[PDB]
């Protein structure tokens with residue numbers, strides 16, 4: 170227990186809160202004097218290029234990303250070949266900038282759910298709200314759990330107090346000011362992440378217990394080489410995971426919040442490209458730390474035998490490396506970097522969920538005659554409630570990671586085909602939307618989730634049991650489910666259009682007014 174690290178982290182938190190409060194004061198008069206609720210969401214559409222790129226990079230680079238890349242490189246049997254997060258993130262951002270985010274910014278939308286509502290109906294727009302909310306909340310809870318574990322590893326401070334304080338600090342400035350405060354804090358937090366991560370690698374590379382990482386990448390010294398390999402029987406699983414990361418990262422409100430706040434559409438394109446480059450730049454020190462951990466004689470350190478992977482502690486390799494192969498102040502620098510990385514994503518997740526709810530459900534479905542003051546108060550109360558709920562789920566649940574993975578798969582399977590259909594396909598109705606929703610939901614539940622101890626209901630070629638007796642799959646059934654959902658959407662939409670436009674079906678049977 171070192172008091173100096175605690176004092177430093179408290180001072181850092183207070184400085185971040187002060188910056189957020191200052192941003193909220195100075196951006197008070199931006200936007201219309203009557204549309205304050207829409208101001209809190211979009212900022213008046215005046216954000217430049219550098220700020221947009223920095224805030225997008227800070228949003229995408231979180232604790233989970235940094236810890237998972239190092240864990241994937243360190244664990245034997247995975248290597249560098251199975252660290253798919255950086256390339257997937259970069260390709261998703263490049264595809265977004267190339268194809269989406271120009272038509273969305275050209276139409277002056279406020280929230281990602283606006284096209285869905287205006288094309289299908291309020292009921293479909295509200296049905297599409299659940300997966301997005303689940304995806305934001307489970308991701309925030311999982312990264313809060315990871316931050317608590319990291320703090321518990323580095324210092325002996327109780328985890329509950331640390332998690333509560335971090336969540337409270339983020340929620341406070343997100344409540345006081347919205348998008349402007351989030352972006353202005355992200356600008357500082359990205360610099361903190363960069364400096365803290367890059368300062369630690371040379372110190373860890375010079376420890377006497379660490380061997381050459383050029384030799385270890387190709388030859389085995391203490392374990393299997395960390396470059397990894399992909400077997401001929403694991404090509405399809407690799408492609409399935411990569412497609413999940415590359416195509417399921419686009420339909421998120423945490424991305425369209427930055428897209429729709431830009432001055433122009435071309436600026437949105439350029440900010441997406443800059444964010445892709447920033448993610449690629451940030452991915453490097455995590456890989457280096459993972460290689461250092463894989464190339465270390467752990468018997469010569471204070472950790473002692475057995476290895477961290479034998480102790481079932483492979484998810485905490487980065488904090489272990491920082492604590493046991495670096496001096497104390499470098500350890501505190503790394504702790505600050507991880508804290509900043511976690512907060513820069515948690516605040517964006519909470520703001521995105523609150524914006525979606527307050528703008529699209531309450532005002533646009535229940536109270537369509539409410540004043541803006543009511544909407545502002547609803548936004549603030551929603552921010553507080555969602556932050557508290559995320560903190561409670563992080564503290565009192567041990568299955569946060571399985572829920573996070575399942576929610577991400579649900580988002581990728583369901584929302585992405587609907588976005589494609591509304592943007593680029595002409596003639597879609599709500600019949601096809603309902604059909605695609607049902608098909609995507611069914612084809613993912615049928616087929617279990619080992620992390621939640623759920624047995625598969627449909628067995629695909631190549632199923633094998635594991636240690637706990639819960640079956641696994643080797644067939645790319647998630648990509649199949651997504652493609653089936655898209656095709657069902659298109660086919661049912663066009664069939665309904667043909668049946669109602671000219672057919673034996675009377676017009677009175679049009680339950681939804683779409684044709």
Ligand SMILES: *[C@@H]1O[C@H](CO)[C@@H](O[C@@H]2O[C@H](CO)[C@@H](O[C@@H]3O[C@H](CO)[C@@H](O)[C@H](O)[C@@H]3O)[C@H](O)[C@H]2NC(C)=O)[C@H](O)[C@H]1NC(C)=O
Nearest residue numbers: 377378390391465466467468469470471472473474475476
């Ligand atoms: C893991 O590291 C430890 C060091 O902390 C290694 O222990 C070392 O073992 C050797 C051989 O047993 C010791 O050399 C001789 O040990 C005898 C006692 O067995 C002692 O009377 C002699 O004077 C001589 O030191 C060596 O001292 C010992 N290291 C320390 C610091 O005492 C251990 O062998 C390593 N494990 C593996 C698998 O290599």
Ligand SMILES: C[N+]1(C)CCO[C@@](O)(c2ccc(-c3ccc([C@@]4(O)C[N+](C)(C)CCO4)cc3)cc2)C1
Nearest residue numbers: 229233237241258308413414417418419421574577
């Ligand atoms: C950037 N977004 C769009 C924000 C929220 O979702 C994502 O972060 C996301 C993150 C991680 C994944 C992910 C899924 C599974 C795994 C993993 O392979 C890791 N393990 C090897 C530990 C167990 C199995 O699951 C790693 C990362 C999927 C989506 C992607």
Ligand SMILES: [Cl-]
Nearest residue numbers: 231232233234
């Ligand atoms: Cl993350």
Ligand code: NA
Nearest residue numbers: 227230513514
């Ligand atoms: Na972040």
Ligand code: NA
Nearest residue numbers: 228355513517
């Ligand atoms: Na952010």
